[PDB]
Every structure is written in structure tokens, then in C-alpha cells.
Amino acid sequence: VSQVRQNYHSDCEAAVNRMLNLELYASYTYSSMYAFFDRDDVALHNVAEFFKEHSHAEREHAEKFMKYQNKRGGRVVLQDIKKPERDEWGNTLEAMQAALQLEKTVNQALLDLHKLATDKVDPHLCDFLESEYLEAQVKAIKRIGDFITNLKRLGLPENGMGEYLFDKHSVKES
Amino acid sequence: VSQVRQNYHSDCEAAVNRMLNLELYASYTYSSMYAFFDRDDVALHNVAEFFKEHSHAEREHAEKFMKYQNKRGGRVVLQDIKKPERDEWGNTLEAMQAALQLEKTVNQALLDLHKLATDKVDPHLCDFLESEYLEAQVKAIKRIGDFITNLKRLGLPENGMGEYLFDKHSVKES
Amino acid sequence: VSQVRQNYHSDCEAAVNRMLNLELYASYTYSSMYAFFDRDDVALHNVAEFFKEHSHAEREHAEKFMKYQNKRGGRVVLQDIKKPERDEWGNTLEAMQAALQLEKTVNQALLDLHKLATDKVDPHLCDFLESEYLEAQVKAIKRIGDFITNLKRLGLPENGMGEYLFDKHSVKES
Amino acid sequence: VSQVRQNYHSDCEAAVNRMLNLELYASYTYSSMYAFFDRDDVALHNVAEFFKEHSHAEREHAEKFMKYQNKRGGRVVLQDIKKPERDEWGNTLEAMQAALQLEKTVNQALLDLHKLATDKVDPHLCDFLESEYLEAQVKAIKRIGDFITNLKRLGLPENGMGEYLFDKHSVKES
Ligand SMILES: [Cl-]
Ligand SMILES: [Cl-]
Ligand SMILES: [Cl-]
Ligand SMILES: [Cl-]
Ligand SMILES: [Cl-]
Ligand SMILES: [Cl-]
Ligand SMILES: [Cl-]
Ligand SMILES: [Cl-]
Ligand SMILES: [Cl-]
Ligand SMILES: [Cl-]
Ligand SMILES: [Cl-]
Ligand SMILES: [Cl-]
Ligand SMILES: [Cl-]
Ligand SMILES: [Cl-]
Ligand SMILES: [Cl-]
Ligand SMILES: [Cl-]
Ligand SMILES: [Cl-]
Ligand SMILES: [Cl-]
Ligand SMILES: [Cl-]
Ligand SMILES: [Cl-]
Ligand SMILES: [Cl-]
Ligand SMILES: [Cl-]
Ligand SMILES: [Cl-]
Ligand SMILES: [Cl-]
Ligand SMILES: [Cl-]
Ligand SMILES: [Cl-]
Ligand SMILES: [Cl-]
Ligand SMILES: [Cl-]
Ligand SMILES: [Cl-]
Ligand SMILES: [Cl-]
Ligand SMILES: [Cl-]
Ligand SMILES: [Cl-]
Ligand SMILES: [Cl-]
Ligand SMILES: [Cl-]
Ligand SMILES: [Cl-]
Ligand SMILES: [Cl-]
Ligand SMILES: [Cl-]
Ligand SMILES: [Cl-]
Ligand SMILES: [Cl-]
Ligand SMILES: [Cl-]
Ligand SMILES: [Cl-]
Ligand SMILES: [Cl-]
Ligand SMILES: [Cl-]
Ligand SMILES: [Cl-]
Ligand SMILES: [Cl-]
Ligand SMILES: [Cl-]
Ligand SMILES: [Cl-]
Ligand SMILES: [Cl-]
Ligand SMILES: [Cl-]
Ligand SMILES: [Cl-]
Ligand SMILES: [Cl-]
Ligand SMILES: [Cl-]
Ligand SMILES: [Cl-]
Ligand SMILES: [Cl-]
Ligand SMILES: [Cl-]
Ligand SMILES: [Cl-]
Ligand SMILES: [Cl-]
Ligand SMILES: [Cl-]
Ligand SMILES: [Cl-]
Ligand SMILES: [Cl-]
Ligand SMILES: [Cl-]
Ligand SMILES: [Cl-]
Ligand SMILES: [Cl-]
Ligand SMILES: [Cl-]
Ligand SMILES: [Cl-]
Ligand SMILES: [Cl-]
Ligand SMILES: [Cl-]
Ligand SMILES: [Cl-]
Ligand SMILES: [Cl-]
Ligand SMILES: [Cl-]
Ligand SMILES: [Cl-]
Ligand SMILES: [Cl-]
Ligand SMILES: [Cl-]
Ligand SMILES: [Cl-]
Ligand SMILES: [Fe+2]
Ligand SMILES: [Fe+2]
Ligand SMILES: [Fe+2]
Ligand SMILES: [Fe+2]
Ligand SMILES: [Mg+2]
Ligand SMILES: [Mg+2]
Ligand SMILES: [Mg+2]
Ligand SMILES: [Mg+2]
Ligand SMILES: [Mg+2]
Ligand SMILES: [Mg+2]
Ligand SMILES: [Mg+2]
Ligand SMILES: [Mg+2]
Ligand SMILES: [Mg+2]
Ligand SMILES: [Mg+2]
Ligand SMILES: [Mg+2]
Ligand SMILES: [Mg+2]
Ligand SMILES: [Mg+2]
Ligand SMILES: [Mg+2]
Ligand SMILES: [Mg+2]
Ligand SMILES: [Mg+2]
Ligand SMILES: [Mg+2]
Ligand SMILES: [Mg+2]
Ligand SMILES: [Mg+2]
Ligand SMILES: [Mg+2]
Ligand SMILES: [Mg+2]
Ligand SMILES: [Mg+2]
Ligand SMILES: [Mg+2]
Ligand SMILES: [Mg+2]
Ligand SMILES: [Mg+2]
Ligand SMILES: [Mg+2]
Ligand SMILES: [Mg+2]
């Protein structure tokens, strides 16, 4: 037993490792979207940068779970980071739809971890999730939903002018 | 009788209370429009902020009538603030059309109050309306009319790209 | 179903709308107290300003619930804002007693909403209430209780000098 | 006829001269109150300064009527400035009551001048009164009424501690 460990269930330790892997998986998916929008035959630079920044944020989420695991006396166990579901992402609308689904998958895993922490009577882990993860997911989901609404209004997928304008006006200029 | 009261007719006092209620009603309508444009399935942020700011301005108009009432020795009497006419506002064009109508309803009430103040030979109340309310209404009505003209030019309600562009270019970026 | 909605029960959505209305009701009550203390026959300016600021804070509380509703994919539904219970508030002691009761009514509604969120296993809503609402209520209740103790010490309601001194020394000079 | 004169009735010219005299009369009354509160057996310095400043303001009001008269092509005609009604002013409450009455006498004269200007179809004179005089009177009357309410709350005339506290806290420290 780690000398620091107190009130930390083995099941929670394992679930934190699984959650870490999912954050890394999400990072990698976002990195793939970055590279896609940077292609010369796609060329939506601001969209590409949005996904690159999302990729970096997910890596930070993963690192924060590593630090958490060690703070509680659990042991980080890494698994393979699976490659993303697609090699090409269609267009801004398809990519944003995939991002929404991914953020909701991540959110569900966080909510499930909170259920487990609640079941094991671990208020520190509950606090950590509530204070560092759950609101970030709600914000991200809202942002991406708002984007999808605007992409549909702009006539995606068919309206190339609409897609061009989204990249100029809806995402940060990079 | 209030020790400060001088040349202030009971009818004017009552009409000021009714006008206060109408300002609060207008505030609440604008708040509803804010919340509508903030919906994930509407997502026109700058339009939402325009209405939020309008809501705040109407609350200031109401507070200024409360202060006025007390300065003259009248007594503030509050009534229920009725909920807005609609729960959802369609799109930017429909909302702006409703806003134009609301501003003209408020303006008519102010003009009617000025008629009453004139009839009761209350130059202080006339001055107050002319100096603090009537020009603000004319300016607001002109601004919203100009917006409606531009929304029609942009192809509302059908042209979603037009609606997107209005939010980017016609209202302040927030 | 809203594209953003996840783990958000219909009952919680409805209770958030009811809570929004109560915040607006509280705002309106505080606005009435402001106008009362601004009367020429009451004339306790610092007390009036305390209530005006409280009114503004409650409106901010309401707006934060509107934003929350939309973040979760619920839909804001507004009802009439009922006028306050009284048209005149007696004196500083009676008004502070009414304010204490109102803050405890608001607090009970927030606690009841937290119970519902707990029952529906909504940790995001629990966090929101705990992080943005519950401590603010405890602080406000303590502040107003402290004021009431001091008003009683100062001989309210009979001791007019005591009431005068409270306005000079216990509430912020405005 | 003055070369500048246009739309300026003889009756209005005369009434402006009478109003000028009343402003000077009010100034002189306030000067008397200043000297009273500066007496060693009265010794309420902040109250004295309040009245001294009021005296100066009334002289400015008079000078503005002189300038107005000449701008319109009327001719300033001065009469004696009558001494104030009392040689001693009792206490802060009695003086404030006299000040309230004086401000309402001045206000009535201004309102009567506005009636005359209206009757003679002189919108410039109406504007001048509304923009430079009528709101100043409403503000002054409200301020003095608020003071009287507070003096009564503080137990005037009998409560000397109350009178002392009013001078420290209700009027500007000089
Ligand atoms: Cl343990
Ligand atoms: Cl334990
Ligand atoms: Cl264990
Ligand atoms: Cl593991
Ligand atoms: Cl794993
Ligand atoms: Cl593996
Ligand atoms: Cl596998
Ligand atoms: Cl996919
Ligand atoms: Cl693929
Ligand atoms: Cl997914
Ligand atoms: Cl889990
Ligand atoms: Cl727990
Ligand atoms: Cl968070
Ligand atoms: Cl947010
Ligand atoms: Cl957007
Ligand atoms: Cl299209
Ligand atoms: Cl198209
Ligand atoms: Cl957008
Ligand atoms: Cl009257
Ligand atoms: Cl009159
Ligand atoms: Cl009347
Ligand atoms: Cl009324
Ligand atoms: Cl009403
Ligand atoms: Cl009502
Ligand atoms: Cl009704
Ligand atoms: Cl409508
Ligand atoms: Cl509707
Ligand atoms: Cl209307
Ligand atoms: Cl009217
Ligand atoms: Cl008039
Ligand atoms: Cl105006
Ligand atoms: Cl203008
Ligand atoms: Cl425009
Ligand atoms: Cl079109
Ligand atoms: Cl179209
Ligand atoms: Cl425009
Ligand atoms: Cl749901
Ligand atoms: Cl869940
Ligand atoms: Cl549900
Ligand atoms: Cl509801
Ligand atoms: Cl309700
Ligand atoms: Cl209702
Ligand atoms: Cl009802
Ligand atoms: Cl009550
Ligand atoms: Cl009542
Ligand atoms: Cl209550
Ligand atoms: Cl509830
Ligand atoms: Cl929960
Ligand atoms: Cl809080
Ligand atoms: Cl505290
Ligand atoms: Cl206190
Ligand atoms: Cl006492
Ligand atoms: Cl007493
Ligand atoms: Cl003191
Ligand atoms: Cl205190
Ligand atoms: Cl002439
Ligand atoms: Cl003419
Ligand atoms: Cl003439
Ligand atoms: Cl003359
Ligand atoms: Cl004279
Ligand atoms: Cl003479
Ligand atoms: Cl004489
Ligand atoms: Cl006298
Ligand atoms: Cl005398
Ligand atoms: Cl007089
Ligand atoms: Cl006259
Ligand atoms: Cl005229
Ligand atoms: Cl003025
Ligand atoms: Cl004022
Ligand atoms: Cl005062
Ligand atoms: Cl007393
Ligand atoms: Cl006494
Ligand atoms: Cl002090
Ligand atoms: Cl005072
Ligand atoms: Fe993440
Ligand atoms: Fe208004
Ligand atoms: Fe509140
Ligand atoms: Fe004057
Ligand atoms: Mg060891
Ligand atoms: Mg284990
Ligand atoms: Mg996994
Ligand atoms: Mg594989
Ligand atoms: Mg937080
Ligand atoms: Mg946004
Ligand atoms: Mg009275
Ligand atoms: Mg009446
Ligand atoms: Mg009405
Ligand atoms: Mg109804
Ligand atoms: Mg103006
Ligand atoms: Mg313009
Ligand atoms: Mg949908
Ligand atoms: Mg429902
Ligand atoms: Mg309710
Ligand atoms: Mg009712
Ligand atoms: Mg917490
Ligand atoms: Mg906190
Ligand atoms: Mg304290
Ligand atoms: Mg000549
Ligand atoms: Mg003449
Ligand atoms: Mg005279
Ligand atoms: Mg004489
Ligand atoms: Mg007329
Ligand atoms: Mg006029
Ligand atoms: Mg003015
Ligand atoms: Mg004041």
C-alpha cells in the first residue's frame, strides 16, 4: 500500500487510468482533425488551429489525471492510444459533429467515474471531477453545438462560401 | 400630502407608475430575446448581447421613473411584470420586428404621458420626458428600423448566410 | 432533444425555470425597498442603496440561471414576476426582517433544487448550485442577521436616532 | 426697441426682473441663516456652510437672469432687496422648514413665469426655465425635505444630541 493512500478504492484507481487513456484518445483524434484541415485540398486554417488547440487541451486533461493518481497513491498504468476512427474528416460540419459526439463520450465517462466515486464514498474524487472536468465538458459541448447550428445555417455541406465564412468569423483568427 | 409635492397631479403620479411598469415589461421582453438567441439551436451571440443590453437599458429607464416619482413626492406603486408575448422569437428578423413594435408602444405611452403633463400644466414632467425619454426612443426606433431594412436585404428569413452575416457585421461584436 | 443535452432531467429543467422566476421576484422586492427608503418621508439613503444593490445582484442570479439552462440544452420559460408582498416597508428593521425571510425562502428553494439534482444524479447541477449560489445565500443571511441584531441594539423601531446611526455606520456610504 | 429683441413680450421682461429680485431675496435669507448658525451660541458649522453655499447659488441664479434679460434685449430693472423675515432662525429644524417654504415660493414663481412664457408663445424662455431652473428647484426641495425627515427622526427640536449628529453626518463637512 502507498504511504499516502487513504479512502481511495482500487476500482476508482483503475477507472482513473481508463479515463486517462480516453483523454489521450481524444487528444489524438483532435490532432488528426488539425492535420486534415491543414491539407492543401482542405485549407481551413482557423478550423485547423481550433482542433490543434483542442488536442493540446485534452493532453492537459490527461496529465492532470496522472498527477491526481499519484497524489492519491494510485499507480498510473498506460495502455495503447488507439488511432482515430477516421483518416479524413469530410468537411467542417462532419468534423464538428464528430467532435460533439467525442465530447459527449468523454462527458459520459466522467459522469460514470463520478457515479463510481459516489458509490465508493470518495468526496475528494467527486470534487476533482466537478471542479476540473464536468463544467469544461458542458462548455465545450455548448460551443460545438453552437458551431454546428451555424454551419447548418451557412448551408454546409454544399455551400462552400458558407464554410469559408465560418472559418473567417466563427473560430479565432490564427 | 408629501412635504415636497408641488404642481404634481394625482393623474400624472398614477401614469408615471403605469409607465414604470411598461419599462419593466419591455426589459423582460428583451431578456427573453437574449435567452432565445443564446440557445444552442439559435446561436447568434452578438444578437443575443444586443438584446441583453437593451434589457438593461429598459431597467435603467424604470429606475429613473422611480427616482422621479419620489423627487416629486409621488409614491411608487408596483404591479406584476407580465411575461413576454412569446416564448420563442423565430429568428433575427421576427425579433427585430417585435422590438420595433415594442419601442413604438413605449414611445406612444411616453407621448401620451407628455399630453397628460401638458394638460395638467406640469412643465417639469414635460422637460423630464423630452430630456430623458423621447429622443432615446426616436434613436432606438431608427436603429431597429435600419436593422430590419438590412435583414430584408440579406434575405431573411430564408437566407441563413445573410442572418449569420448580420450577427457578425451589424451588431457590436461581444 | 437539444443536441447538447446530456444527463439533464426534465424535472431539473423545470425547477431551474421556477428558480429563475424566484430570483426575479426577489430582485423586484429589493427594488421596492430601494424606492421606499428613497421617499422624502423615509430618507435613509445608504439603506436605499443597499437594497438597490441587492436588487441588481438578484437580477444577476436570474441571468446566470438563464445561461445555465441554455448550456445544458434546456429551454428558458418565463412567467409573470409577481409584485412584492408590501407597498411600504415600515422602517429599516421591518425591511431587514423581510429581507432575511426572503433570503431564507430563496435558500430553501436552492436547497430543494439541490435535492432534486441529487435525486436525478446530476453532479454538474449540484456543483453549479454549491459553487455559485449556496455560499452566497449563507453570507447574505449572516449579513442581514447581523444587521437585525444591530438594529435591535439601536432601539428600533422607536429609536429614530438609532435608525439614523445605522444608516450612517452599518451600511456602505453611497 | 432693442436691435436684438424678437418675440419677447414686455410682460415677460417685467416678470424676469421680478424673478431676479426674488432670487436676490432668497440669497439674502440664506446669508442670514449662515450668520445665525455661525453664532457662538448656535455653533453648527456644517449647517452654517450649507446655507452659505445656498446663498451663493441663489446669487448665481440672479446673475443668470440678468444675462438672460440682456440676451433677449430686455432691460434689467433692480429693486430693493428686502431683509429676511426673521433675524434669528431658532434651530436647524426651524431653519430647514423656512428653507423648504422659500424654495417652494421660488419654485411657484418660476412655474408662474413659465405659464406667462407659454401664454406669450415664448419657447426660448420656456426652455430656459426648464433647462436652468425648474429641475434645480425640484432637487433642492427634495434634499431639504429629506433633511427635515431626518431632523424629526433625530428628535428635533428637543434632542440636542440629534441636532449635533445631523451637523456631523447629514451636511458636508466643511
Ligand atoms: Cl485506501
Ligand atoms: Cl473514509
Ligand atoms: Cl480498494
Ligand atoms: Cl488500470
Ligand atoms: Cl485503458
Ligand atoms: Cl494496450
Ligand atoms: Cl484492442
Ligand atoms: Cl467518427
Ligand atoms: Cl476515413
Ligand atoms: Cl465518440
Ligand atoms: Cl467508471
Ligand atoms: Cl462522498
Ligand atoms: Cl470544470
Ligand atoms: Cl460559459
Ligand atoms: Cl458559433
Ligand atoms: Cl445555402
Ligand atoms: Cl449551396
Ligand atoms: Cl458562430
Ligand atoms: Cl401638488
Ligand atoms: Cl402651478
Ligand atoms: Cl391632484
Ligand atoms: Cl398607481
Ligand atoms: Cl401598471
Ligand atoms: Cl398586479
Ligand atoms: Cl391582468
Ligand atoms: Cl410579439
Ligand atoms: Cl411562442
Ligand atoms: Cl408591442
Ligand atoms: Cl398617460
Ligand atoms: Cl406646462
Ligand atoms: Cl432622451
Ligand atoms: Cl442620432
Ligand atoms: Cl443597420
Ligand atoms: Cl436572398
Ligand atoms: Cl435564401
Ligand atoms: Cl446594418
Ligand atoms: Cl438528457
Ligand atoms: Cl449519466
Ligand atoms: Cl427527462
Ligand atoms: Cl418550466
Ligand atoms: Cl415560475
Ligand atoms: Cl405567468
Ligand atoms: Cl397566480
Ligand atoms: Cl413581507
Ligand atoms: Cl403595504
Ligand atoms: Cl419570503
Ligand atoms: Cl426543486
Ligand atoms: Cl450526482
Ligand atoms: Cl456561492
Ligand atoms: Cl464570509
Ligand atoms: Cl452589522
Ligand atoms: Cl433605545
Ligand atoms: Cl426610543
Ligand atoms: Cl457618530
Ligand atoms: Cl453593524
Ligand atoms: Cl419683441
Ligand atoms: Cl413669433
Ligand atoms: Cl410687448
Ligand atoms: Cl420691471
Ligand atoms: Cl421686484
Ligand atoms: Cl425698490
Ligand atoms: Cl415695500
Ligand atoms: Cl420665516
Ligand atoms: Cl426674528
Ligand atoms: Cl417663503
Ligand atoms: Cl409671472
Ligand atoms: Cl411656445
Ligand atoms: Cl434645472
Ligand atoms: Cl437628483
Ligand atoms: Cl438627508
Ligand atoms: Cl428623541
Ligand atoms: Cl429629547
Ligand atoms: Cl464618523
Ligand atoms: Cl440625512
Ligand atoms: Fe478531456
Ligand atoms: Fe424604455
Ligand atoms: Fe438570488
Ligand atoms: Fe434660486
Ligand atoms: Mg512504503
Ligand atoms: Mg487495484
Ligand atoms: Mg477506454
Ligand atoms: Mg486498431
Ligand atoms: Mg467550477
Ligand atoms: Mg459562445
Ligand atoms: Mg409629512
Ligand atoms: Mg393619487
Ligand atoms: Mg401597462
Ligand atoms: Mg398571463
Ligand atoms: Mg435631449
Ligand atoms: Mg445608425
Ligand atoms: Mg437539432
Ligand atoms: Mg420537460
Ligand atoms: Mg415560484
Ligand atoms: Mg397579484
Ligand atoms: Mg464543489
Ligand atoms: Mg465556493
Ligand atoms: Mg460582516
Ligand atoms: Mg438702436
Ligand atoms: Mg415693458
Ligand atoms: Mg417679488
Ligand atoms: Mg421692511
Ligand atoms: Mg402648450
Ligand atoms: Mg415645452
Ligand atoms: Mg435638465
Ligand atoms: Mg439625497
From Swiss-Prot, chains A, B, C, D:
Its EC number is 1.16.3.1. GO terms for cellular component: cytoplasm. Stores iron in a soluble, non-toxic, readily available form. Important for iron homeostasis. Has ferroxidase activity. Iron is taken up in the ferrous form and deposited as ferric hydroxides after oxidation. Residues 6-155 form the Ferritin-like diiron domain. CDD domains: Ferritin. It is an enzyme of class 1 (oxidoreductase). This is Ferritin, middle subunit. PANTHER family: FERRITIN. Keywords: Iron, Iron storage, Metal-binding, Oxidoreductase. Pfam families: Ferritin. Fe cation 1 binds at E23, E58, H61. One of its GO terms (biological process) is iron ion transport. Fe cation 2 binds at E58, E103, Q137, A140. Transmembrane segments: none annotated. Belongs to the ferritin family. Oligomer of 24 subunits. The functional molecule is roughly spherical and contains a central cavity into which the polymeric mineral iron core is deposited. It catalyses: 4 Fe(2+) + O2 + 4 H(+) = 4 Fe(3+) + 2 H2O. There are three types of ferritin subunits in amphibia: L, M and H chains. M and H chains are fast mineralizing; the L chain is very slow mineralizing. GO terms for molecular function: ferric iron binding; ferrous iron binding; ferroxidase activity. The keyword Electron transport does not apply.
